[PDB]
Enzyme design. Structure first.
Site, PDB file in Angstrom:
ATOM      1  N   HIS A 178       1.011   1.168  -5.850  1.00 50.17           N
ATOM      2  CA  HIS A 178      -0.213   0.809  -5.883  1.00 50.17           C
ATOM      3  C   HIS A 178      -1.196   1.634  -6.453  1.00 50.17           C
ATOM      4  O   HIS A 178      -1.862   1.690  -7.329  1.00 50.17           O
ATOM      5  CB  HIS A 178      -0.576   0.040  -4.568  1.00 50.17           C
ATOM      6  N   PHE A 196      -8.955 -16.240  -3.176  1.00 50.00           N
ATOM      7  CA  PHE A 196      -9.330 -14.643  -3.370  1.00 50.00           C
ATOM      8  C   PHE A 196      -9.929 -14.472  -4.826  1.00 50.00           C
ATOM      9  O   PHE A 196     -11.031 -13.855  -4.864  1.00 50.00           O
ATOM     10  CB  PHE A 196      -8.021 -14.062  -3.333  1.00 50.00           C
ATOM     11  N   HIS A 240      -6.918   6.977  -2.786  1.00 53.23           N
ATOM     12  CA  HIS A 240      -7.675   6.169  -2.076  1.00 53.23           C
ATOM     13  C   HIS A 240      -6.990   5.301  -1.162  1.00 53.23           C
ATOM     14  O   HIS A 240      -7.691   4.959  -0.593  1.00 53.23           O
ATOM     15  CB  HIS A 240      -8.471   5.133  -3.263  1.00 53.23           C
ATOM     16  N   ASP A 241      -5.767   5.214  -1.134  1.00 54.49           N
ATOM     17  CA  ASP A 241      -4.975   4.481  -0.071  1.00 54.49           C
ATOM     18  C   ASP A 241      -3.877   5.332   0.597  1.00 54.49           C
ATOM     19  O   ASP A 241      -2.934   4.993   1.352  1.00 54.49           O
ATOM     20  CB  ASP A 241      -4.218   3.232  -0.534  1.00 54.49           C
ATOM     21  N   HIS A 283       0.744  -1.408  -0.071  1.00 57.95           N
ATOM     22  CA  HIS A 283       0.083  -0.055  -0.168  1.00 57.95           C
ATOM     23  C   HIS A 283       0.528   1.176   0.000  1.00 57.95           C
ATOM     24  O   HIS A 283       0.779   2.359   1.043  1.00 57.95           O
ATOM     25  CB  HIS A 283      -1.121   0.002   1.062  1.00 57.95           C
TER      26      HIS A 283
END
Ligand code: VL9
Ligand code: MG
Ligand code: ZN
EC number: 3.1.4.53
Length: 336
Positions: free
Chosen positions: A88, A296, A124-125, A84
């Site tokens: 990314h 996943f 967003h992160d 993160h």
């Protein structure tokens, strides 16, 4: 003038330009972009996207405001977190940029919608500490205290992204009208909050209903004639982008897998030292990378991309085919 042309300093302008030839393709290699941008993949890619879409001109954003803002945002991604980090973020931004040009979504979105979705991807992160919401909650962290245990990190990412607009020469939305700014803010909040995995099953149910009710124009594009339908596609699109690692080339996917597991195992190590139960996939003594990737994909990534594929049918067929090949490769790597 490395700077006027690209986001950033490189020296390696030739190699950087070569990589950025793949800007509009799913097969762009962001790890190469980072290597040739002095490790500023997020500033570099956002600049390239924004020039490619003419967004700086449309929204009267000076180059210098943009770069100042992007470099600051990028500096707030932690470079000691394995997954993160700003790599990314750059990948999701670039992937959202590619999804937005899906032929069935041609001229469906306004410029402001396009701006909101790419901005949302970038932010967003931001400032992710490399542990989950549940970890922050269970360790009584300040962030969890600030946000009352609810979408802790996702709320924080929005707050940081929007607070950074106030630093000196960072206000990229200064020349929007007040109403555009309100609208974009609403859209961005919606999209980033939607990246919380606790909402995945809701997004997917809404996406399936979009598929079942879809209408196609005479021109062959999707008809999305209200805000609710539009933001629902957009939030699913940024969610798809966030969950797009398994749909890239196997060489890319494997690198993303290695980094997410390194990040998980570090959280598992902190859990182990504190005497806590270790979160799923975070215990390096017992986890199976391969079973975990195939689980996943089977339970989260394929049902989402299959539904995405049905909505823009057949425009995501090659993405879906690559996911399925990568799933089978990891499956074949499960011991016994
Ligand atoms: C590259 O690679 C990747 C990438 C990416 C990824 C992502 C990120 C993120 C985060 Cl971090 C956060 N958020 O918010 C967002 C996002 Cl986007 O994550 C996800 O998504 C998850 C995480 C977590 C979960 C839930 N649970 C799970 C489990 O736990 O699991 C186990 C059990 N069972 C057994 C084993 C394993 C498998 C199964 C699940 C559940 C159900 C099914 C599946 C999964 S989700 C991953 C990955 O990898 C993995
Ligand atoms: Mg997140
Ligand atoms: Zn993400």
């Amino acid at each position: 003038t490395s700077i006027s042309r690209f986001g950033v300093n490189t020296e390696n302008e030739d190699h950087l330009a070569k990589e950025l030839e793949d800007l509009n393709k799913w097969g762009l290699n962001i790890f190469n972009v980072a290597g040739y941008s002095h490790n500023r993949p997020l500033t570099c890619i956002m600049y390239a996207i924004f020039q490619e879409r003419d967004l700086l001109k449309t929204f009267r954003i000076s180059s210098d405001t943009f770069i100042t803002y992007m470099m600051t945002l990028e500096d707030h991604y932690h470079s000691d977190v394995a997954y993160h980090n700003s790599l990314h973020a750059a990948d999701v931004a670039q992937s959202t940029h590619v999804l937005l040009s899906t032929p069935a979504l041609d001229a469906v979105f306004t410029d402001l919608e396009i701006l909101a979705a790419i901005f949302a991807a970038a932010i967003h992160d931001v400032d992710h500490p490399g542990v989950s919401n549940q970890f922050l909650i269970n360790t009584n962290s300040e962030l969890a205290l600030m946000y009352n245990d609810e979408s802790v990190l996702e709320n924080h990412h929005l707050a940081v992204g929007f607070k950074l607009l106030q630093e000196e020469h960072c206000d990229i939305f200064m020349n929007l009208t007040k109403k555009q700014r309100q609208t974009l803010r609403k859209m961005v909040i919606d999209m980033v909050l939607a990246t919380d995995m606790s909402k995945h099953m809701s997004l997917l149910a809404d996406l399936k209903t979009m598929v079942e009710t879809k209408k196609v124009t005479s021109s062959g594009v999707l008809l999305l004639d209200n805000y609710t339908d539009r933001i629902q596609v957009l939030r699913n699109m940024v969610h798809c982008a966030d969950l797009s690692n398994p749909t890239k080339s196997l060489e890319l996917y494997r690198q993303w897998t290695d980094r997410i597991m390194e990040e998980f195992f570090q959280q598992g190590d902190k859990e182990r030292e504190r005497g806590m139960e270790i979160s799923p996939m975070c215990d390096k003594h017992t986890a199976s990378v391969e079973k975990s990737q195939v689980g996943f994909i089977d339970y989260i990534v394929h049902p989402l991309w299959e539904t995405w594929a049905d909505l823009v049918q057949p425009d995501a067929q090659d993405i879906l085919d690559t996911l399925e090949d990568n799933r089978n490769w990891y499956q074949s790597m499960i011991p016994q």
